[PDB]
Amino acid sequence: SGFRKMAFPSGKVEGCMVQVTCGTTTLNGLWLDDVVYCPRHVICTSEDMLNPNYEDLLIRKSNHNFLVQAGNVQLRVIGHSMQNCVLKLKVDTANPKTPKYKFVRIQPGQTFSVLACYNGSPSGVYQCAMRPNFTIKGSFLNGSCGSVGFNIDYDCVSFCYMHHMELPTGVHAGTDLEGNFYGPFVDRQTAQAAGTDTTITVNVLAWLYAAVINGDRWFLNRFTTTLNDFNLVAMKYNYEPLTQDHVDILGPLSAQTGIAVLDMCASLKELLQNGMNGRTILGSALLEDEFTPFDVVRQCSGVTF
Amino acid sequence: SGFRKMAFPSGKVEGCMVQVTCGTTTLNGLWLDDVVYCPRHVICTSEDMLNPNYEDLLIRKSNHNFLVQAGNVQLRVIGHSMQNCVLKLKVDTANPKTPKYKFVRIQPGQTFSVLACYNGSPSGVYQCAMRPNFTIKGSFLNGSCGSVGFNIDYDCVSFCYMHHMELPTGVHAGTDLEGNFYGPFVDRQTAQAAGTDTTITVNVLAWLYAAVINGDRWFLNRFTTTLNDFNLVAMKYNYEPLTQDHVDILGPLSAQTGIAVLDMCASLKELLQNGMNGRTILGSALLEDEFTPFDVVRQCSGVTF
Ligand SMILES: CC(C)NC(=O)CN1C[C@@H](C(=O)Nc2cncc3cc(F)ccc23)c2cc(Cl)ccc2C1=O
Ligand SMILES: CC(C)NC(=O)CN1C[C@@H](C(=O)Nc2cncc3cc(F)ccc23)c2cc(Cl)ccc2C1=O
Ligand SMILES: [Cl-]
C-alpha cells in the first residue's frame, strides 16, 4: 500500500557524472564508455549567448581547451565533435562504471528521473514529466546544465534528457542525448516563452486507477461518456485530448479494476465540475498528472483492494 | 527555480543491498563491512508471526539456514546474533562498496530518503518524513521488508530506518538500524494501529519560505502573532506545537526572505482559518509538511554529495 512520486535508484547515473570546463564556464557532463556528453553552450561566453555561432566558436578550440574532471582525476580529451546541441568529448579512458545504456527520445506525458548535479557532483534525485508544451518543471539552479533525465526499466539505463536552460517562467528546457531540443526551443539567450501548458489526461486517468487499486472509490459515478463528449469537456479545463491510443494503453488497468476507460472518463468529468469537496485522492487535493499508465502498473499491486 | 520532493542520490546505499532468505521467507538486508542487517522476522513462518519467541526460533537456526545473495554471488554466513528487532548475520567477506556510515535514530518531523528494494534489488527512491505518530507514509509491497531510510551529511551515509511492516491504514512501521521501533509497534501479526497524526508545523513554515524564495507571495500579510497565540491556533487544527527551537532553526530563511518567523505564522494562521481560496502554493492545494528547514536551504543552495 501507499503511492509515492518515486524516482529510479540513481547509482548507475552517479558513476557517469563529470565536470566539464572550457574557460570560465563550468557545467556537468555524462561519461559513457570513452565519450563525455555535455551542452554545447559550454564554449560560449555570456557575450556570445544572444546569437552564438557554435561552428565558428568550436573550430577555435583544441582538445586541451576542455578540462574534464571525474572525481579528483583529470581526464585527457583526445577528440571533440558537435552533434546538434550536444558536444561530444572523446577521452583517453573508458568509464569503468559505464552501465548498460540506450539513448531514447521521449514524447510529452512521459516521466523520468532527474539526477540534479553541480560541478560534476550529484545533489538530488526527483521524478518529473515532459509537459505537453515540451518543458519540464524541474528544480535547477545555476551550474545544473548537463544534469540528466533517465529511466531504468530492468538493468538498462535509458537516457532521455539533458538540461540546457531555464525559461522566464521558471520552467526548464533541454535536449535528448543526440542534442535535439524538446519543443521549439534554441540554445540562445533570445526571448523565448513556453506555450500554454495543459494537463496530461491519460496520466490523470492512470492515477485515478491507482487510487481505485489502493482501495478508494468515492469519485466514481454511475455514468459513462463517449470519447468525443469527454474531449469537448476536457479541453474546457485545459486538459490534453484523450486519443484512442490512450484508451488502448489504459486497457490493462481497466481489466484489473473492473472499470471501463470511458466510465473512468465520466468520473474525471465529474471531478473537474465539482472539485474534491474537502476530500483527497492518494493524499492529494489536486488531480495528479505525472504518473503514466506504465508507472502505475510498476508501483501498484496486481491485486485491487 | 522550481521546488521538488527531492531524495538523496541512492548509489552509496544500492551497493549495500542484499537478499536474505530463511526457509520460505525472502527479504532485504543491508551489508556493511562483514555484517548483514535485516528484520528479525525473516526467521518466522506465518504461524510463528502470531506470537513469536525470537530467541527460541533463533536458537534452532544454524549459519547455513540463512542464504545471503549479493548480486549473483552467494555470501557465506559465519555467525548470527540478534539486537532488538534486527538480525545481524556475520559474513566471511567485508563489503568492498561499504561507504562511510553512521547509524542514527531520527525524531518525528525529520525527513529521509527510502530506497525501496525487492529480492535485494533496488526498485525506487523516494523522500518521506517520520510522522509525529511515528509511522511513515511509504510505498511498499510484499518483499519490501529490510528496505532502508537514510540521509547523507557531507560524504557520510546516516542510516535511520529499516522497514518491517504495514499497518491496516496502509501506513508503515519500522526500526532504527539498532532494531528499536519508531512508535508503539511490535513485530508480530496482531491488531496494531497508528495513533491520530498531526501536521509538522516547522516543516510547513519552511515550505512557505521555499514558496516565497520561488516567487509565490500571495499568502503574505502585514500581520504578526505571538508564539503563544499561534500555538493556541495550531493546536485547534491538529498541528504540532511550534517551539522557540523551531523559531531559531527558521532564522536563516527568515533573514533571506525578510519575513520574520512569527510574521509567517500569521500567514499560516490565516491559511488554516480561511483556506487557499482556489489558489495553490508551489503547485499544491494542501499545506506540505515533508520538507524540513534544512531541506529547503539545501535545495535552494545546491549542496552536493
Ligand atoms: C534565469 C536563466 C535564464 N539564467 C540566466 O540568467 C542565464 N542563462 C544561463 C543558462 C541557463 O539558463 N542556466 C540555468 C539552467 N537551469 C536553471 C537555472 C537557474 C538559474 F537561476 C540560473 C541559470 C539556470 C542559459 C543556457 C542557455 Cl542554452 C540559454 C540561455 C541561458 C541563460 O540565459
Ligand atoms: C499488512 C499485513 C496485513 N500483511 C500481511 O498479510 C502479513 N504481514 C507481513 C509483514 C508485513 O507487514 N509486510 C509488508 C510490509 N510492507 C508492505 C506490505 C504490503 C503488503 F501488501 C503486504 C505486506 C507488506 C509483517 C511484519 C511484521 Cl513485523 C508484523 C506483521 C506482518 C504482517 O502482518
Ligand atoms: Cl515516450
Side-chain angles (χ1 to χ4, degrees):
Chain A
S1 198
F3 206 77
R4 280 285 184 169
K5 187 136 287 175
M6 194 178 283
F8 283 99
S10 61
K12 288 170 166 62
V13 178
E14 294 168 49
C16 302
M17 304 309 308
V18 300
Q19 188 189 66
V20 182
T21 306
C22 201
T24 181
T25 308
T26 289
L27 45 64
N28 309 284
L30 184 67
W31 180 29
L32 297 165
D33 298 312
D34 60 350
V35 180
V36 167
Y37 302 83
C38 75
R40 68 181 178 170
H41 77 256
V42 72
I43 73 183
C44 301
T45 72
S46 275
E47 193 222 334
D48 273 309
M49 287 305 305
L50 263 166
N51 289 294
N53 188 313
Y54 291 101
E55 289 79 14
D56 190 69
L57 293 176
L58 191 55
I59 200 74
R60 308 166 186 269
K61 309 262 134 97
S62 65
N63 296 328
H64 57 281
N65 294 141
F66 297 99
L67 304 176
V68 179
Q69 195 176 310
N72 273 118
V73 182
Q74 201 65 33
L75 295 182
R76 196 171 65 102
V77 175
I78 63 162
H80 63 266
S81 82
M82 181 168 58
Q83 179 182 11
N84 303 308
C85 302
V86 286
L87 186 59
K88 296 190 279 190
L89 298 171
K90 197 69 157 170
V91 294
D92 216 29
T93 310
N95 185 3
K97 295 182 188 158
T98 306
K100 269 185 52 56
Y101 76 93
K102 283 174 162 193
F103 287 173
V104 173
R105 185 171 175 87
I106 59 161
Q107 296 300 314
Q110 183 68 261
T111 61
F112 54 95
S113 299
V114 173
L115 181 63
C117 300
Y118 298 92
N119 299 294
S121 283
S123 53
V125 65
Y126 58 88
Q127 187 73 357
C128 67
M130 171 64 54
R131 303 306 310 171
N133 69 359
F134 291 102
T135 71
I136 79 168
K137 293 188 179 180
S139 171
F140 287 131
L141 303 180
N142 192 25
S144 59
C145 297
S147 293
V148 298
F150 64 96
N151 286 290
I152 312 184
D153 309 294
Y154 296 84
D155 157 66
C156 176
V157 182
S158 51
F159 292 106
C160 59
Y161 178 85
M162 176 172 268
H163 183 57
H164 287 240
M165 60 183 198
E166 183 170 293
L167 293 161
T169 54
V171 304
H172 305 99
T175 68
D176 55 34
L177 268 291
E178 294 182 276
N180 296 114
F181 258 90
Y182 286 101
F185 303 111
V186 293
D187 50 0
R188 280 164 70 191
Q189 226 166 55
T190 200
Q192 293 176 79
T196 298
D197 203 29
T198 49
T199 303
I200 309 155
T201 313
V202 62
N203 284 8
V204 177
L205 290 167
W207 172 87
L208 286 178
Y209 277 112
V212 173
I213 289 172
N214 283 213
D216 205 348
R217 294 177 54 102
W218 68 257
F219 46 83
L220 303 179
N221 66 28
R222 69 180 217 273
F223 302 113
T224 189
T225 182
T226 69
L227 183 58
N228 206 60
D229 283 354
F230 173 77
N231 284 329
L232 286 172
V233 189
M235 296 174 73
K236 300 167 181 190
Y237 295 93
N238 267 29
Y239 266 60
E240 274 297 294
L242 192 76
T243 68
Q244 184 54 215
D245 269 18
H246 297 146
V247 176
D248 292 351
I249 292 172
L250 292 158
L253 285 169
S254 170
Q256 183 184 336
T257 64
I259 306 158
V261 177
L262 293 173
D263 279 16
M264 190 64 87
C265 285
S267 301
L268 179 52
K269 273 161 84 184
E270 193 170 86
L271 280 169
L272 294 173
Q273 167 188 274
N274 294 348
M276 296 215 196
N277 301 310
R279 294 168 290 199
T280 55
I281 295 173
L282 290 174
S284 179
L286 287 186
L287 302 175
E288 292 241 48
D289 72 350
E290 297 204 350
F291 297 101
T292 68
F294 188 101
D295 293 343
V296 171
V297 165
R298 181 167 197 270
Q299 173 165 187
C300 287
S301 171
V303 188
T304 304
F305 182 37
Chain B
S1 313
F3 205 69
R4 283 285 180 179
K5 188 136 286 176
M6 193 175 287
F8 283 100
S10 59
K12 287 171 165 57
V13 178
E14 293 169 51
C16 303
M17 305 307 309
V18 299
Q19 182 191 58
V20 182
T21 303
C22 190
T24 185
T25 305
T26 291
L27 46 64
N28 309 284
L30 184 68
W31 180 29
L32 298 165
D33 298 310
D34 60 351
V35 180
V36 167
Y37 302 83
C38 76
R40 69 177 180 173
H41 68 254
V42 71
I43 72 183
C44 303
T45 70
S46 192
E47 163 81 357
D48 284 325
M49 284 303 295
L50 299 174
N51 176 34
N53 186 316
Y54 289 100
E55 176 204 11
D56 190 67
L57 292 176
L58 193 51
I59 62 96
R60 308 165 186 268
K61 308 262 136 168
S62 65
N63 295 328
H64 272 270
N65 295 140
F66 298 98
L67 305 176
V68 179
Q69 195 176 307
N72 275 119
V73 182
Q74 201 66 32
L75 294 182
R76 175 165 178 86
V77 175
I78 63 161
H80 62 266
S81 80
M82 182 170 290
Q83 179 181 13
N84 303 307
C85 303
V86 150
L87 186 60
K88 296 191 280 193
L89 298 171
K90 198 68 157 171
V91 294
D92 80 338
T93 310
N95 186 3
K97 294 180 182 174
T98 305
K100 265 187 56 259
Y101 76 93
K102 280 176 163 178
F103 286 173
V104 311
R105 185 171 175 89
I106 60 159
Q107 295 301 313
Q110 303 196 295
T111 60
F112 54 96
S113 298
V114 172
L115 182 62
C117 303
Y118 297 92
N119 300 294
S121 167
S123 53
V125 66
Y126 58 88
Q127 187 72 358
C128 67
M130 179 57 64
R131 302 305 311 169
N133 68 1
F134 292 103
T135 71
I136 79 170
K137 293 188 178 181
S139 175
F140 288 126
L141 303 178
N142 192 23
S144 68
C145 298
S147 294
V148 298
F150 64 97
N151 284 291
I152 306 178
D153 5 65
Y154 301 89
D155 74 307
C156 177
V157 181
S158 301
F159 292 107
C160 61
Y161 181 83
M162 173 173 277
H163 186 54
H164 288 241
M165 56 182 238
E166 182 170 292
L167 291 173
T169 55
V171 305
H172 304 99
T175 72
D176 54 35
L177 267 291
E178 292 182 275
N180 299 293
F181 258 97
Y182 286 100
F185 305 115
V186 299
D187 51 354
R188 41 194 263 247
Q189 244 274 272
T190 199
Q192 306 190 58
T196 290
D197 206 21
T198 51
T199 302
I200 311 154
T201 314
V202 61
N203 286 8
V204 176
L205 290 166
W207 171 86
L208 287 183
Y209 278 112
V212 173
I213 290 172
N214 272 278
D216 242 327
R217 298 177 74 92
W218 66 259
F219 50 82
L220 302 178
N221 66 31
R222 65 156 63 238
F223 303 111
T224 190
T225 179
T226 68
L227 186 56
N228 270 47
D229 283 354
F230 174 76
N231 283 328
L232 284 172
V233 162
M235 178 174 286
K236 171 177 147 156
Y237 293 95
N238 268 29
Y239 266 59
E240 277 296 296
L242 193 76
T243 66
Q244 183 55 33
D245 196 28
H246 296 148
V247 176
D248 294 350
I249 291 171
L250 292 159
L253 286 168
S254 170
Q256 180 185 337
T257 64
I259 307 157
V261 176
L262 293 172
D263 179 12
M264 191 68 91
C265 280
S267 275
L268 181 52
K269 175 217 296 182
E270 301 307 319
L271 295 168
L272 293 175
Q273 301 168 339
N274 304 283
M276 296 217 194
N277 300 308
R279 293 168 291 197
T280 55
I281 295 172
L282 288 173
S284 180
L286 290 180
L287 299 173
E288 172 74 56
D289 72 350
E290 298 205 350
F291 295 100
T292 68
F294 299 91
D295 293 343
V296 172
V297 167
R298 196 181 298 113
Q299 194 180 157
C300 302
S301 83
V303 169
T304 65
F305 314 93

